[PDB]
Amino acid sequence: MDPFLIKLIGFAAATCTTVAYAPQFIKVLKTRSARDISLGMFLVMVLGLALWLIYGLLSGDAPLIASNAVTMLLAGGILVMKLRYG
Amino acid sequence: MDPFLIKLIGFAAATCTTVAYAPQFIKVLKTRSARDISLGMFLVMVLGLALWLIYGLLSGDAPLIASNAVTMLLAGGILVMKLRYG
């Protein structure tokens, strides 16, 4: 059978990491401004998440795919992006 | 055989994500101060990385383990932690 059980453990660990950093997203979200975060960074960051999506599909893992989507949600960065617009 | 080849692709993707966010670490590192980053966040963040280490060992994956260590290096956060000390 597939290592579905193993992936389950990884999913919990992945969420734990996002939960730890998530508070950081909220703090910046309160001001909706990027002080040290550059606009170009967002463009590259998107590629990183995009790659994870493909990797999950290639691995046929569902947990990893769902985890990646959740991380992107918390990551946001879109609100601050609208600060300079475009 | 083990999905070593598949893990290789995931490794490249993992590095791409760290490379995208890495610039963020450098920006804050220049000031060595945490403006929106709380001290308690670092404590939780450590647990997240720690979990990844165990997951890699349980999965018997080498690439994932190495990737996790690299991410932690870029993540740093220690320099800013010394700002308030303890």
Measured distance CA(A41)–CA(B19) in Å, rounded: 10
Query: CB within 8 A of A35, min separation 6: which ones?
Result: A28, B35, B36
Q: Are A13 and B68 in contact (CB under 8 A)?
A: no
**Domain locations along chain A:** 4-81
DSSP state of A3: S
Three-state DSSP at A60 gives: coil
Question: In whole angstroms, what is the distance from residue A22 CA to residue A16 CA?
Answer: 10
Q: Which fold has domain B4-81?
A: Monooxygenase (1.20.1280)
Q: Are A41 and B21 in contact (CB under 8 A)?
A: yes
Cβ–Cβ gap B24/A10 under 8 Å: no
Minimal Cα–Cα distance from A58 to chain B, Å? 8
Q: Determine, for residues A20 and B58 on separate chains, whether the beta-carbon distance falls below 8 Å.
A: no
